[PDB]
Amino acid sequence: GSMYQLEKEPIVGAETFYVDGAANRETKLGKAGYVTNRGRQKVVTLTDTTNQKTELQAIYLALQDSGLEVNIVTDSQYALGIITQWIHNWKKRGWKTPVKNVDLVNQIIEQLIKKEKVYLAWVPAHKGIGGNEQVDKLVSAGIRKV
Ligand SMILES: CC(C)(C)N(Cc1ccccc1)C(=O)COC(=O)c1cc(Br)c([N+](=O)[O-])o1
Ligand SMILES: [Mn+2]
Ligand SMILES: [Mn+2]
Numbered sequence: 001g002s003m004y005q006l007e008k009e010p011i012v013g014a015e016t017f018y019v020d021g022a023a024n025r026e027t028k029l030g031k032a033g034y035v036t037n038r039g040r041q042k043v044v045t046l047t048d049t050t051n052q053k054t055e056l057q058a059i060y061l062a063l064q065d066s067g068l069e070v071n072i073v074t075d076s077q078y079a080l081g082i083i084t085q086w087i088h089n090w091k092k093r094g095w096k097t098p099v100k101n102v103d104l105v106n107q108i109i110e111q112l113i114k115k116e117k118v119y120l121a122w123v124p125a126h127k128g129i130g131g132n133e134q135v136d137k138l139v140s141a142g143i144r145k146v
């Protein structure tokens with residue numbers, strides 16, 4: 001957009017973080033984390049959270065733990081949309097910042113502009129044995145039935 005350009009296609013060669021978050025509304029308990037194609041993984045447990053917050057928190061962890069070039073695969077359309085819109089509309093007319101999750105998205109943006117290249121893509125969550133499926137099992141354990 002303006003303060004940054006996300007990549008149009010995955011960065012060839014760069015580590016890929018399959019991120020996910022899961023939360024339970026009745027208890028506000030959740031988990032967020034990632035598995036990568038270089039054999040990394042991390043799961044953090046969270047309190048006082050929401051599904052959308054956990055999806056964003058997982059992106060934050062991926063940005064925190066990655067190098068200067070990073071591929072991130074999320075299944076959260078919200079997470080991808082609010083981050084991309086923030087990048088496309090900064091210091092530009094017509095922009096009111098969101099009324100929810102604003103502090104967490106600001107933390108993500110501050111991590112993002114530190115990077116050299118970021119590819120961020122949405123996949124519908126799906127069944128199988130791939131990356132999105134693995135991190136989903138990890139963050140859903142004890143949080144939601146699969
Ligand atoms: C995809 C499949 C088919 C293996 N499931 C089962 C499942 C699908 C949809 C909702 C709950 C569980 C998962 O992977 C786990 O669900 C997620 O990951 C998930 C759902 C949604 Br909605 C989001 N999201 O907006 O981040 O993530
Ligand atoms: Mn998810
Ligand atoms: Mn998932």
Ligand SMILES: [Zn+2]
Nearest residue numbers: 028047048049
């Ligand atoms: Zn609490």
Ligand SMILES: [Zn+2]
Nearest residue numbers: 068069116117
């Ligand atoms: Zn580089």
